[PDB]
Design an enzyme around this catalytic site. Structure first.
Site, mmCIF file in Angstrom:
data_model
loop_
_atom_site.group_PDB
_atom_site.id
_atom_site.type_symbol
_atom_site.label_atom_id
_atom_site.label_comp_id
_atom_site.label_asym_id
_atom_site.label_seq_id
_atom_site.Cartn_x
_atom_site.Cartn_y
_atom_site.Cartn_z
ATOM 1 N N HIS A 200 1.424 3.732 -3.311
ATOM 2 C CA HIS A 200 0.704 4.997 -3.258
ATOM 3 C C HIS A 200 1.609 6.191 -3.519
ATOM 4 O O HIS A 200 1.180 7.340 -3.391
ATOM 5 C CB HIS A 200 -0.007 5.152 -1.923
ATOM 6 C CG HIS A 200 -1.392 4.589 -1.933
ATOM 7 N ND1 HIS A 200 -1.654 3.270 -2.225
ATOM 8 C CD2 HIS A 200 -2.593 5.174 -1.722
ATOM 9 C CE1 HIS A 200 -2.957 3.060 -2.177
ATOM 10 N NE2 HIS A 200 -3.549 4.201 -1.875
ATOM 11 N N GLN B 196 0.829 -1.200 0.000
ATOM 12 C CA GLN B 196 0.000 0.000 0.000
ATOM 13 C C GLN B 196 0.869 1.258 0.000
ATOM 14 O O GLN B 196 0.789 2.087 -0.923
ATOM 15 C CB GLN B 196 -0.940 -0.003 1.210
ATOM 16 C CG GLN B 196 -2.136 0.933 1.088
ATOM 17 C CD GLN B 196 -3.097 0.819 2.264
ATOM 18 O OE1 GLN B 196 -2.923 -0.023 3.147
ATOM 19 N NE2 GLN B 196 -4.117 1.669 2.276
ATOM 20 N N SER C 170 5.518 -3.572 -13.200
ATOM 21 C CA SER C 170 6.325 -3.479 -11.993
ATOM 22 C C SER C 170 7.805 -3.379 -12.353
ATOM 23 O O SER C 170 8.526 -2.497 -11.887
ATOM 24 C CB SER C 170 6.043 -4.698 -11.106
ATOM 25 O OG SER C 170 6.873 -4.731 -9.969
ATOM 26 N N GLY D 275 0.942 -7.919 -14.348
ATOM 27 C CA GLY D 275 1.529 -7.180 -13.240
ATOM 28 C C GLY D 275 3.039 -7.059 -13.315
ATOM 29 O O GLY D 275 3.602 -5.996 -13.047
ATOM 30 N N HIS E 27 -6.964 -5.171 -2.115
ATOM 31 C CA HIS E 27 -7.733 -5.090 -0.873
ATOM 32 C C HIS E 27 -8.097 -6.426 -0.205
ATOM 33 O O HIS E 27 -8.374 -6.443 0.994
ATOM 34 C CB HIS E 27 -9.015 -4.292 -1.124
ATOM 35 C CG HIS E 27 -8.765 -2.913 -1.647
ATOM 36 N ND1 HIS E 27 -8.541 -2.655 -2.981
ATOM 37 C CD2 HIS E 27 -8.671 -1.721 -1.012
ATOM 38 C CE1 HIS E 27 -8.331 -1.361 -3.148
ATOM 39 N NE2 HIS E 27 -8.407 -0.772 -1.969
ATOM 40 N N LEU F 284 -5.106 -3.021 -11.696
ATOM 41 C CA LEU F 284 -4.547 -4.314 -11.353
ATOM 42 C C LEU F 284 -4.093 -4.379 -9.901
ATOM 43 O O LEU F 284 -4.243 -5.406 -9.244
ATOM 44 C CB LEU F 284 -3.377 -4.611 -12.292
ATOM 45 C CG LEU F 284 -2.577 -5.899 -12.201
ATOM 46 C CD1 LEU F 284 -2.127 -6.282 -13.598
ATOM 47 C CD2 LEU F 284 -1.371 -5.717 -11.289
ATOM 48 N N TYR F 285 -3.550 -3.275 -9.405
ATOM 49 C CA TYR F 285 -2.863 -3.270 -8.117
ATOM 50 C C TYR F 285 -3.789 -2.953 -6.960
ATOM 51 O O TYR F 285 -3.352 -2.465 -5.917
ATOM 52 C CB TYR F 285 -1.705 -2.271 -8.143
ATOM 53 C CG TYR F 285 -0.406 -2.819 -7.588
ATOM 54 C CD1 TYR F 285 -0.357 -3.416 -6.341
ATOM 55 C CD2 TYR F 285 0.768 -2.751 -8.325
ATOM 56 C CE1 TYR F 285 0.827 -3.911 -5.835
ATOM 57 C CE2 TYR F 285 1.953 -3.249 -7.834
ATOM 58 C CZ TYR F 285 1.980 -3.831 -6.587
ATOM 59 O OH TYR F 285 3.167 -4.329 -6.092
HETATM 60 C C1 HEM Z 1 -7.449 -0.632 5.639
HETATM 61 C C2 HEM Z 1 -6.962 -0.787 4.403
HETATM 62 C C3 HEM Z 1 -7.442 -0.018 3.144
HETATM 63 C C4 HEM Z 1 -8.387 0.928 3.011
HETATM 64 C C5 HEM Z 1 -9.294 1.545 4.099
HETATM 65 C C6 HEM Z 1 -8.440 1.318 1.617
HETATM 66 C C7 HEM Z 1 -9.279 2.261 1.077
HETATM 67 C C8 HEM Z 1 -9.150 2.836 -0.164
HETATM 68 C C9 HEM Z 1 -9.927 3.948 -0.660
HETATM 69 C C10 HEM Z 1 -11.040 4.680 0.117
HETATM 70 C C11 HEM Z 1 -9.520 4.222 -1.897
HETATM 71 C C12 HEM Z 1 -10.073 5.339 -2.808
HETATM 72 C C13 HEM Z 1 -11.330 4.847 -3.518
HETATM 73 C C14 HEM Z 1 -12.066 6.014 -4.123
HETATM 74 O O1 HEM Z 1 -11.539 7.156 -4.074
HETATM 75 O O2 HEM Z 1 -13.184 5.804 -4.657
HETATM 76 C C15 HEM Z 1 -8.463 3.296 -2.234
HETATM 77 C C16 HEM Z 1 -7.781 3.264 -3.433
HETATM 78 C C17 HEM Z 1 -6.708 2.454 -3.739
HETATM 79 N N1 HEM Z 1 -6.267 1.371 -2.976
HETATM 80 FE FE1 HEM Z 1 -6.847 0.887 -1.024
HETATM 81 N N2 HEM Z 1 -7.508 0.579 0.920
HETATM 82 C C18 HEM Z 1 -6.881 -0.249 1.830
HETATM 83 C C19 HEM Z 1 -5.881 -1.145 1.526
HETATM 84 C C20 HEM Z 1 -5.174 -1.186 0.341
HETATM 85 C C21 HEM Z 1 -3.978 -1.963 0.097
HETATM 86 C C22 HEM Z 1 -3.278 -2.885 1.120
HETATM 87 C C23 HEM Z 1 -3.581 -1.751 -1.160
HETATM 88 C C24 HEM Z 1 -2.327 -2.413 -1.789
HETATM 89 C C25 HEM Z 1 -1.956 -2.249 -3.063
HETATM 90 C C26 HEM Z 1 -4.517 -0.821 -1.771
HETATM 91 C C27 HEM Z 1 -4.486 -0.333 -3.060
HETATM 92 C C28 HEM Z 1 -5.162 0.763 -3.555
HETATM 93 C C29 HEM Z 1 -4.832 1.467 -4.776
HETATM 94 C C30 HEM Z 1 -3.686 1.156 -5.757
HETATM 95 C C31 HEM Z 1 -5.854 2.599 -4.901
HETATM 96 C C32 HEM Z 1 -5.941 3.651 -6.037
HETATM 97 C C33 HEM Z 1 -5.339 4.983 -5.584
HETATM 98 C C34 HEM Z 1 -5.357 6.007 -6.694
HETATM 99 O O3 HEM Z 1 -5.710 5.654 -7.843
HETATM 100 O O4 HEM Z 1 -5.017 7.191 -6.445
HETATM 101 N N3 HEM Z 1 -5.473 -0.504 -0.824
HETATM 102 N N4 HEM Z 1 -8.262 2.455 -1.152
HETATM 103 C C1 MXM Z 2 1.201 -9.228 -9.380
HETATM 104 C C2 MXM Z 2 2.596 -8.713 -9.683
HETATM 105 C C3 MXM Z 2 2.986 -7.442 -9.568
HETATM 106 N N1 MXM Z 2 4.278 -7.257 -9.902
HETATM 107 C C4 MXM Z 2 4.895 -8.389 -10.269
HETATM 108 N N2 MXM Z 2 6.175 -8.436 -10.668
HETATM 109 C C5 MXM Z 2 6.766 -9.585 -11.060
HETATM 110 O O1 MXM Z 2 6.182 -10.647 -11.278
HETATM 111 C C6 MXM Z 2 8.096 -9.442 -11.441
HETATM 112 C C7 MXM Z 2 8.777 -8.228 -11.112
HETATM 113 O O2 MXM Z 2 8.005 -7.197 -10.676
HETATM 114 C C8 MXM Z 2 10.121 -7.925 -11.399
HETATM 115 C C9 MXM Z 2 10.828 -6.945 -10.706
HETATM 116 C C10 MXM Z 2 12.194 -6.818 -10.932
HETATM 117 C C11 MXM Z 2 12.861 -7.715 -11.766
HETATM 118 C C12 MXM Z 2 12.160 -8.749 -12.380
HETATM 119 C C13 MXM Z 2 10.821 -8.898 -12.052
HETATM 120 S S1 MXM Z 2 9.822 -9.875 -12.745
HETATM 121 O O3 MXM Z 2 10.661 -11.008 -13.330
HETATM 122 O O4 MXM Z 2 9.110 -9.161 -13.908
HETATM 123 N N3 MXM Z 2 8.838 -10.548 -11.814
HETATM 124 C C14 MXM Z 2 8.955 -11.468 -10.658
HETATM 125 S S2 MXM Z 2 3.803 -9.623 -10.181
#
Ligand code: HEM
Ligand code: MXM
Ligand code: HEM
Ligand SMILES: *[C@@H]1O[C@H](CO)[C@@H](O[C@@H]2O[C@H](CO)[C@@H](O)[C@H](O)[C@H]2NC(C)=O)[C@H](O)[C@H]1NC(C)=O
Ligand SMILES: *[C@@H]1O[C@H](CO)[C@@H](O[C@@H]2O[C@H](CO)[C@@H](O)[C@H](O)[C@H]2NC(C)=O)[C@H](O)[C@H]1NC(C)=O
Ligand SMILES: *[C@@H]1O[C@H](CO)[C@@H](O[C@@H]2O[C@H](CO)[C@@H](O)[C@H](O)[C@H]2NC(C)=O)[C@H](O)[C@H]1NC(C)=O
Ligand SMILES: *[C@@H]1O[C@H](CO)[C@@H](O[C@@H]2O[C@H](CO)[C@@H](O)[C@H](O)[C@H]2NC(C)=O)[C@H](O)[C@H]1NC(C)=O
Ligand code: MXM
Ligand code: NAG
Ligand code: NAG
Lengths: 553, 553
Positions: free
Chosen positions: B176, B172, B499, B495, B357, B353-354
């Site tokens: 972010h 997270q 990444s 992904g 939650h 993709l990322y």
């Molecule tokens: C208690 C834990 C969490 C809460 C309360 C939460 C809540 C939220 C909220 C409210 C949003 C914005 C949605 C909107 O504006 O409509 C968001 C976006 C997002 N969340 Fe989470 N989330 C949590 C955990 C996580 C985790 C662990 C990840 C790990 C990747 C994650 C990834 C994302 C991403 C990538 C976005 C998009 C942000 C952007 O586009 O600016 N969230 N989340």
């Molecule tokens: C769900 C995923 C999000 N990011 C992922 N990345 C990989 O599977 C991946 C890397 O991110 C990467 C990072 C540095 C060097 C090589 C690798 S990778 O071979 O493309 N691989 C494990 S999987």
């Protein structure tokens, strides 16, 4: 304790770093050298350098034996050398960029903040004995006196290569899309965040300006009709910030991409030409793609024009300029097998270097007329009175001034030169010789060796005290020219890398962009591929004048 | 006349271009295919495609035979494979970036305006029969219903790989810094103009904020002392925009690089960690370079933390993520011999993709305690109450949910997923199968085949009406996992490239930057090279807790 880095100890692009109170270390990583100061060479480095012909010899080669070259040009060797030429030059330029006016070291801010110009050599440390590092006097020669003595034109010295004013106005117009120093932010900062051939001098350096410039119909740019001929619109119809002398109404100002283009008719000439070209391309595109909207037509047209600009600049501008018998070729695919980064960052040294003010004549001959600077500068009707065909003919017929050699800047604009020197001192640029080494040349041992004469050499020696204290831009403009050439070796060996890095470093030159689809198909792609100066002018005119970067004889 | 591009006729990354009133053409350039739809392979393409095993096979290989891998890892075969993987993965992602929300074609605005997220596939044309192109119903399934039916967690499904919440908050926190969608500009726009690992979630995404965060003494960031421990400063001392609940006292608001990090104690935990690391690094730096100014110390420390970040993400984060027996390695020199673009543009698909939650638990256990979402969310005292060590240990011990599979998102945050689907419809993302094909996979012929079961498959079949109409994020989250994995093959194959590009595309990975001098000498360089999560935490704490990305045995 004196800053050791003031001695510029690290050679061959080794990075001097301050350790402790009075110590230094050199980062010799990937320099081809090792040792305390990066002075101990490797195998291949030693081979390479000991088998390296001088730039003078290379220049001799490229400028002699028309037989050999007419052969080479008709064979694959053309590409070969070209590619070689491409790979060897660009490498001189750090990519991603390194330093700027605020940081003499690599930093994330230096990378992410494109409001800065970059630089190739870090600045003279502020805790240095003399202004240029170690050598020289306590106070640098007076800028004004310097210019007056060595740069001021007495008798007009024409370019021996036959360069005309068409070339001159093209150079000015073209370079003023990435040379735009910010007067509010000061030296070392720029408004042309495109940092290359983005054609921001046509479409504007910013979105809102662009939008004000656009017709938003058929992808086209706004325009006005005068004597049955297309011109840029007025500020009345296109409310855009133009830098005119106060007292001139928005009704009388023409709106274009660059705010300063109203101050010279040659500039507005090129603005007119490119505007017309843009709308003509739009016509072709819309004919081909009836389903497209305004946006896609505008954007695609812009791409095509960027391609055309790069194509012409390489195959004709840099051609004329170089005087090479090798036919230069614009083909991105030559780099598709190489390690090349398609990003560009305008350097301050590039800025300084491109001040080609000696090109401007004593007066401006238009047919039987001869207009002075007062008549020409800020003239608001000349373009419309004569028309494009006439001014293009006129400029193409009148020869420009030799750039290098000294004493060839018209007194009307000498102040620019003065300011340049002054800015160079604010920018704390390293001495000429440092840049010499930086671009693969030996430093000069004396002013005589630089000038190729004795008088100027003697007085410059008097002024600077040491050759190692000679400043960059003075050094460029006072260096002896290659035989019959428009400037010296330093201008070329320093300017070429920046130049082609900026041309080929453009994203349209990437494998990702270099496709027919990018230019709306085969028609656009071909427009780019077959772009010439003659076409650019005549295809948008009723009649076809003499159009060329050199005088007709 | 229907838009032909709606049928997605162009295969293998061919570019569909609208010609005439109802025609199309495919740009097949450098795709390795030919013919009208780019379906006729070249000899080398054909060869390459026949000899290429499936992604599942490769997964098996990487996840079996610990012996073979323990041999490979002690050899240069590690480097060879790693390089192979790097090249292969990175070649999927276009560089320079292609499209954005406004432009489904290559444009100068899409290159220059880094306020846009980019996209790999163009949007579904606004003149299409069905929302996804030509397949499916006139109306997409209700996002809320979709979520409630297939994403709502009934029973907690822990991640079979041993993933903990330390990993979850790491993911997270880390992601972010380049996922910051603009609430004011709308869908498809970002505030993180860094588009990569710039550590703006620590330093701020703008200069003003950065300056407000900096002590401007010895390169450090501002901080406060609570219970003998170092914490981010209060807003009262570092006045920056933070998104806190209206009513919370300013002296209870910590100022960090990312505005939303005060909403979760895990986020503020990591923020604290990195802060302490920055200032400690500064101590090292200044010790090595007493003559250095605060600015240089700051910038160098920043670059060092960026290096440590990519180091840990690649060698520990992604390692735990993938479960490979192949020990991954962060070595920029592996790419010095290849053609790679050191630049990155965050893709919207990568954003979608990322959304992991499902990682979040039902409750958050801290020692004997077990807090609820209503106790944990927006808790502004938890971090200070327990301290860093306690929270790190706690999060390191508690397991995380499995991401793939389906029905594993806690009801507290399920709404996020809903809003994602909706946005995916705003963004007009192409269906799952198109993105499958875009990333070198075969499209699913049924929901049966997708889910590997029959219940969800049948209901989904009823809702969507066709498999080729299954949306991106739903397909990702409902796709059957690999044996005992945390998600399915799509989450990996799409992904990974993103990444990868994000990590290695960083300019510090460049041959220009990857020098000891960039990091203030051997010491900084070594900090980057030997960086470790365990070290990251324990070197800045008083006691050493359990710190890992997986639960203990
Ligand atoms: C208690 C834990 C969490 C809460 C309360 C939460 C809540 C939220 C909220 C409210 C949003 C914005 C949605 C909107 O504006 O409509 C968001 C976006 C997002 N969340 Fe989470 N989330 C949590 C955990 C996580 C985790 C662990 C990840 C790990 C990747 C994650 C990834 C994302 C991403 C990538 C976005 C998009 C942000 C952007 O586009 O600016 N969230 N989340
Ligand atoms: C769900 C995923 C999000 N990011 C992922 N990345 C990989 O599977 C991946 C890397 O991110 C990467 C990072 C540095 C060097 C090589 C690798 S990778 O071979 O493309 N691989 C494990 S999987
Ligand atoms: C009558 C013709 C010309 C006039 C009146 C003129 C005048 C000027 C002036 C007043 C400046 C700004 C100086 C300052 O603000 O201190 C400038 C900048 C510059 N000029 Fe010229 N110039 C002319 C021709 C040319 C030509 C032919 C070139 C060819 C390359 C050229 C190259 C440059 C460059 C590179 C700059 C720096 C711009 C920047 O840093 O943003 N000039 N010129
Ligand atoms: C790029 O750097 C310049 C120079 O630091 C930034 O402009 C400075 O902004 C600071 C703080 O906001 C001001 O105190 C200075 O007055 C500014 N300097 C100048 C010369 O204007 C500029 O904001 C940076 N650009 C970006 C996009 O971050
Ligand atoms: C701007 O240039 C125009 C040329 O288009 C100048 O007008 C000419 O100048 C002299 C008159 O003194 C003669 O050569 C011609 O009779 C004029 N031609 C036309 C078409 O009028 C004009 O003088 C210049 N303006 C300024 C302010 O210098
Ligand atoms: C990047 O593109 C966006 C979208 O075109 C620009 O924001 C728009 O600017 C125009 C004119 O300035 C306004 O009429 C729109 O309302 C704006 N749209 C949004 C969503 O803000 C933005 O200014 C561009 N940024 C840069 C640096 O060029
Ligand atoms: C924020 O978290 C803190 C923990 O630091 C909560 O305080 C604890 O609450 C439990 C109740 O379950 C008590 O048994 C502990 O004694 C409390 N510890 C301290 C130091 O007060 C607090 O309840 C949470 N705040 C909110 C608003 O939910
Ligand atoms: C004074 C100069 C300014 N720019 C110069 N450029 C050249 O000498 C130069 C190019 O700019 C270039 C452009 C594209 C491809 C290859 C070349 S070049 O070989 O570096 N050469 C003529 S010289
Ligand atoms: C390296 O440079 C320093 C400072 O110029 C000088 O004292 C030293 O002798 C040099 N050593 C070599 C091998 O050039
Ligand atoms: C190309 O694709 C279109 C759309 O699916 C299809 O109608 C057409 O028959 C295809 N042509 C060939 C030669 O495969």
């Amino acid at each position: 304790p004196v800053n050791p880095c003031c001695y510029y100890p690290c050679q061959h692009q080794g990075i001097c770093v301050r350790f402790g109170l009075d110590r230094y270390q050199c980062d010799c990583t990937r320099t081809g050298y090792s040792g305390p100061n990066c002075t101990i060479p490797e195998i291949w480095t030693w081979l390479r350098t000991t088998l390296r012909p001088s730039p003078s010899f290379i220049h001799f080669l490229l400028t002699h034996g028309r037989w050999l070259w007419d052969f080479v040009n008709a064979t694959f060797i053309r590409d070969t050398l070209m590619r070689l030429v491409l790979t060897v030059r660009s490498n001189l330029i750090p990519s991603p960029p390194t330093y700027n006016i605020a940081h003499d070291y690599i930093s994330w801010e230096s990378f992410s903040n494109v409001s800065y110009y970059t630089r190739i050599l870090p600045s003279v440390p502020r805790d240095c004995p003399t202004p240029m590092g170690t050598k020289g006097k306590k106070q640098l020669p007076d800028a004004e006196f310097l210019s007056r003595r060595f740069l001021l034109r007495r008798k007009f010295i024409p370019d021996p290569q036959g360069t005309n004013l068409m070339f001159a106005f093209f150079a000015q117009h073209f370079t003023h899309q990435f040379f735009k120093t910010s007067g509010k932010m000061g030296p070392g900062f720029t408004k042309a965040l495109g940092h290359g051939v983005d054609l921001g001098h046509i479409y504007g350096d910013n979105l809102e300006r662009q939008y004000q410039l656009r017709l938003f119909k058929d992808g086209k740019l706004k325009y006005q009709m005068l004597n049955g001929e297309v011109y840029p619109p007025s500020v009345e119809e296109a409310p855009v910030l133009m830098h005119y002398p106060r007292g001139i109404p928005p009704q009388s100002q023409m709106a274009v991409g660059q705010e300063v283009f109203g101050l010279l008719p040659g500039l507005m000439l090129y603005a007119t030409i490119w505007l017309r070209e843009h709308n003509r391309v739009c016509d072709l595109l819309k004919a081909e793609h009836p389903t497209w909207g305004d946006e896609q037509l505008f954007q695609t047209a812009r791409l095509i024009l960027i391609g055309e600009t790069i194509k012409i600049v390489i195959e004709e501008y840099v051609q004329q300029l170089s005087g090479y018998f090798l036919q230069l070729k614009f083909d991105p695919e030559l780099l598709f097998g190489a390690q090349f980064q398609y990003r560009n960052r305008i350097a301050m040294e590039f800025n300084q270097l491109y001040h080609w003010h000696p090109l401007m004549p004593d007066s401006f001959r238009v047919g039987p007329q001869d207009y002075s600077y007062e008549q020409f500068l800020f003239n608001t009707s000349m373009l419309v009175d004569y028309g494009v065909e006439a001014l293009v003919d006129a400029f193409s017929r009148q020869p420009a001034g030799r750039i290098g050699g000294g004493r060839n800047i018209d007194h009307h604009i000498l102040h620019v030169a003065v300011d340049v020197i002054k800015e160079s001192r604010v920018l704390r640029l390293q001495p000429f010789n440092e840049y010499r080494k930086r671009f693969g040349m030996k430093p000069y041992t004396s002013f005589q060796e630089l000038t190729g004469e004795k008088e100027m050499a003697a007085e410059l020696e008097e002024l600077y005290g040491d050759i190692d204290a000679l400043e960059f831009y003075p050094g460029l403009l006072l260096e002896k020219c290659h035989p019959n050439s428009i400037f010296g070796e330093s201008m070329i060996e320093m300017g070429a890398p920046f130049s082609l890095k900026g041309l080929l470093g453009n994203p349209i030159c990437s494998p990702e962009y270099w496709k027919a689809s990018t230019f709306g198909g085969e028609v656009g792609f071909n427009l780019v591929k077959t772009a010439t100066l003659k076409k650019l002018v005549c295809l948008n005119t009723k009649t076809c004048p003499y159009v060329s970067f050199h005088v007709p004889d």
